[PDB]
Design a protein around this ligand. Sequence first.
Ligand SMILES: [Br-]
Lengths: 310, 310, 310, 310, 310
Amino acid sequence: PPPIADEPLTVNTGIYLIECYSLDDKAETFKVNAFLSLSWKDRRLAFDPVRSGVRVKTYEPEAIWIPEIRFVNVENARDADVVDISVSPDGTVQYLERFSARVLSPLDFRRYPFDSQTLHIYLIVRSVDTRNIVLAVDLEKVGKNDDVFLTGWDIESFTAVVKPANFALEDRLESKLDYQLRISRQYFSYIPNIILPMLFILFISWTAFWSTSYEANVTLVVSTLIAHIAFNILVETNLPKTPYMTYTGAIIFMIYLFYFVAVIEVTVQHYLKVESQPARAASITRASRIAFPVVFLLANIILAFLFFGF
Amino acid sequence: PPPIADEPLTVNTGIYLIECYSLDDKAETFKVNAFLSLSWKDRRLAFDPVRSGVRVKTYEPEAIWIPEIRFVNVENARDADVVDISVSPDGTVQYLERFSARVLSPLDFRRYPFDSQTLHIYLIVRSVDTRNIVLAVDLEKVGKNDDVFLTGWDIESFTAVVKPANFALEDRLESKLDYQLRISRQYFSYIPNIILPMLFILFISWTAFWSTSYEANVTLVVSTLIAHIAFNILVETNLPKTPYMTYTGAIIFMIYLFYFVAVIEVTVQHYLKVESQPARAASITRASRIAFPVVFLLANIILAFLFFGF
Amino acid sequence: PPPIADEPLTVNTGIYLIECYSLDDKAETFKVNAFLSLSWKDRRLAFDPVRSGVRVKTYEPEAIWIPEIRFVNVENARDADVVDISVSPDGTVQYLERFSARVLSPLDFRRYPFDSQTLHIYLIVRSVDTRNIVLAVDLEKVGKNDDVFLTGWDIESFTAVVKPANFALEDRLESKLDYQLRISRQYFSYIPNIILPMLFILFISWTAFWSTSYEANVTLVVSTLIAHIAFNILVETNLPKTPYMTYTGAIIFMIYLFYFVAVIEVTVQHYLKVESQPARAASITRASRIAFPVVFLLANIILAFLFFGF
Amino acid sequence: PPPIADEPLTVNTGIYLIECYSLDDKAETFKVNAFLSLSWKDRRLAFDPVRSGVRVKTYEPEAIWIPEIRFVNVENARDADVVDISVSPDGTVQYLERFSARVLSPLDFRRYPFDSQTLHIYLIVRSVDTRNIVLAVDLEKVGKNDDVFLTGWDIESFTAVVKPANFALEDRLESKLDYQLRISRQYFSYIPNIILPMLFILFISWTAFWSTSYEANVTLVVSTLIAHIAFNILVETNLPKTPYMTYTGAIIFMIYLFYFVAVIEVTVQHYLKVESQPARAASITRASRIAFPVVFLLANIILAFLFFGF
Amino acid sequence: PPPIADEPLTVNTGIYLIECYSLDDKAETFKVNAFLSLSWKDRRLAFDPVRSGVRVKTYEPEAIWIPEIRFVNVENARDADVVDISVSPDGTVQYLERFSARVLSPLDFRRYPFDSQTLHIYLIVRSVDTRNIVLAVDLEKVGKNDDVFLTGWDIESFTAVVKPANFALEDRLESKLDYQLRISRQYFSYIPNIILPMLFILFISWTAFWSTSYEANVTLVVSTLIAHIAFNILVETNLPKTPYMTYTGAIIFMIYLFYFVAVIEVTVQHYLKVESQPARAASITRASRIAFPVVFLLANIILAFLFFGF
Ligand SMILES: [Br-]
């Protein structure tokens, strides 16, 4: 039973994040629990303060006409309990729910361990005969308690794009708003647990430049290449199948090379020292002791710069 | 209370995918959230535009008779909230829900990392006294926003088989429609993380052709064979028990061989170099240095062609 | 308000499997989605075809008395939506639901990779004053679409035991029916991924019979014994704690032996070749080269025969 | 509307287990599906057999006053459908439901692989003005069909503590009953899959007593110590964090020692055979060949006795 | 229909934990099942004891006005069944539910294996025209049965902050209470299964100080470094991505070093014993045999003190 207007009735929205949690890098989703604040003029139930009752009159959902405000990017129907409805005398309605749905926003894993994000929440509203434009009321949008969690992410800002986007969707215009949650990752536990350990094995790898034994040079360069897979696999696991290249997927894959040429050297420093020409052997071996850490440190500056500095 | 017809009443369907996500290769399911658009002539509630009210009249579900449109391949009862019902004067009803159910469509892992798919959504409708044929209205089927996700899959097209399939199921004909979601995989992260690393270990494996030590040739060929299982197992895990053979299950199993004969060689290059006949040893060893990468590259062309080129 | 009979009222049942999925070997359960067809004479609402209305009269569940048909082996209350109720003039009722519950049927893992199964679904019905016998109507039991899935299982037949079992359960007889789903496993992906790889490691294990080095004979027989645990563990995982012995649990455990005596040999071929008696060493080592694959192939024929051939 | 009594009204209870399953050693819970049989004198609806109707009168739940019988140790609200209600003439009510809730009973993992258990189900009932004592009717308690499952557990007995425990809980006495499900584990699959394999690796470990090579003695004792972790980890996983010590956690940890002193020996039989004193070496090595299996078999009798024999 | 007051109506709260379980260190949540005790003066339904009925009058929820008491940190809408409502004559209401929701409280993993915690449960209550202050009634707060579980945690105390926190949230003050569950971990199973085994491997690592062979010194220090990752990975898994440093993440990462310089030494004791200067070699090697365990034991006292002693 919608409110007879003279023009496109505006519905005023707001979101107060109460809880944030379980951001799931694999599925690219996150769970939010927040307030939903709606409001509109329904002159139809304006009501004579003096003449009866009091300042503001409390209704149940069934009485009033209420606008269907559906979330756009969501696994299932949102999950709200209603908190209070209060009609002002000028026929102005004040709605407040407290929903909790899991939200499907995509992430950009281009800088993986060192990445910043921009989560989205949507809310469309389809029209009937009287058009619906949604818009934001920025006093009920200051939504994000000084308690918002989000394990392993620093929360930067919850803002929103004032100007809605009015679509034409199946012979009925809808109106869609963009609520933005800006977060940066807590890269760090990525160092003691991935980055450093991954590097340490890589150095030990090429300790076999100061060695002459093949037996202990493969028991060396090879035994470390395995450990790398343990890390490649550990990392490849808490991360989705990007159609593009990650930063750690880069330096994790650049690494695979410095083991391949590493093994090449030890190998050559053999069909080169069984061909009685150790003239060359401990000449090559002597060089790798520099070429490597330098090509590396060079390629990491090349690689690093390639991703962040551009 | 169904609409007295003169012949099989047609119900006109449509689906606008709002969200796609969590395609689960193991369980062979995916979750979809979309619009469901139904419509039919129920002359029974035609209504004199001029004589009363307005252009179109809004009903609640309970009032009108509405057709039971059940999804065929679905874990549980679909999960829909109703969005609007609008009856035209000629007794024409306009229905719109916004459901979200998880869908059971099978996948063909024959080309695993490099595979394309054809997801299905069904919709039957069982009859009573007046028959039900369903059919598609292609203005409400253009369903798939320029935002449809599906992590790690490129979406190609959402179309549908106009001609329904009318069954006879337990003394009552049902009518089933075929909605098709065509997707190709984002093979790629499959390279830096599986294909390449898997290959690198295989090469190092057979570095033991340029070596004479048994101690360092098993510490060699064997230490890599393990790494392979770490990959076989990693891969075998994010994949169901196909009764047929995968492509990577092929080349992952073709590989097991090139380690077995690899180990055979190093082994023979021993009970052949302890039998003072290194005449033969560094003759065989010398050969393997070619036989292998060639039998391989040959067998991969043989293998690859076998799967895609046919 | 139950139908005044003159004797034990018969209720006629049937099930049309629409979907089968997620058979869970660990929990010994499976999920089914099907039609449930019930029917009985309730002379009490017979109704004069000519005198009023039409051929058959449609009721809601609340109107008619309907028999509580509870599933016996089920995690939770079954999960049904009602599809149609149609009363015939002779007072004969036609019921049809479309439930989906997860079913607790046990499995016999005696032949694990090569095992066939017999799933059960139950349906009791407790009496009040007029007794209830259930029984099957085999036109609504032909239930299993040419689409029934069940990943990694070949479905053989869905039949049912016509004669119910009438219990006395707490001073009220119930009537229970036995619906049988017969399935065989898709053993196969068990070969390229378990059986073969498991065998290959076992062979390499005992390549150390054609070797003299202890260093490379333990680096040998031992490095494979580990791989076996990787498989024992992989297999032990997708299988419950049987109080009996599996077939692959057998040959997986028979295997552990052929590594133990394998290691015994290499060990003895040492405190026997450091005791300057290589007379004996390369005599024993020479023999194992046959004793083993033969005791094995013999014991697998002994073992295999023991399970299937009896 | 509770039944005006002259003293504490007794409610008579009973449970017929229909299904048992998914006993979860980690969470310490199990799922049960059973009958719940209640009964009490509500003289208030006694009813003149001859004067009207019949022998017993069938009511719906809403009519009669029924006692709130809540389960004490349960994840969520129990999950019951009602099966039948029958009031006797003397005002005696006969209730019967068929619930299925998951039950939180603790387990004693002190003897882990060889442990017996005592599951609990509770049922309180809070009073109003007339007190409620619950008590058991042992004809509706013979609950446990000759079909009760419980994968990997032998079921011994379902009995119950006739005498309830009347609490005072928040100015209202409740009455709690103790239903006991006694089960022993099916230890066995624990042998071919854990116990034996775990032992075999331990023996091979100390084959390095009949060896002189350090290279092959570490490639020996060490390569097995890993295998052990694979088992320690496999076992530690299907088991909760006991604040006490398991039996297999014991013998799994006693084992870690026999690898440590095992490695100590091989190590010493080296900075003792490079100090040209093989006088001592193959004297110590010679001894370990006994000290070990004996200290072990001794410590296992010491250990085993310590747990079961006391 | 809220109770006309003369000032901010106080609502008196309380919680009786019946069950605690599944504390999930990764997600930082826990599941609780407890009583919720509310109470307030609604003079509006005071009721003449003598004049009619009895001492206290039982209502259903729909009759009385009841305050919306929403939990603040919760995944979804809490999950409560109502247990009893009793209105006193002075218009005083007595409410009792029995909810079960999963609770989002954060944890401080700074001392991981040896950490104590402080779980929170919240309860706000938004106002309308008459303000709501909540407050605690400490006879219905003694909530935590002598049965409260919480696997692998010792429960210390369930108390609550008497003084609520009255917010202004969107032009309506809410009133929030703090219920505290204080728990310490059952560190222990962390020793036989993580701490000790992790240490053992570390010692064996540096047995290669009493050795001269490079071949068996890398087959040594390296083979253990892998085992460490198996533990680093095992531990890193049952723990979230802290933006700070764990204690075991410390000593697990301090360890990585003592393997790196460990490998450095064995490596140097080679390009130093192939340079015919074993003067120095078995001088350095001789020293490491002390420097290491001491730098360690020193650094663990340095490390340990750094975390707990401050
Ligand atoms: Br491993």
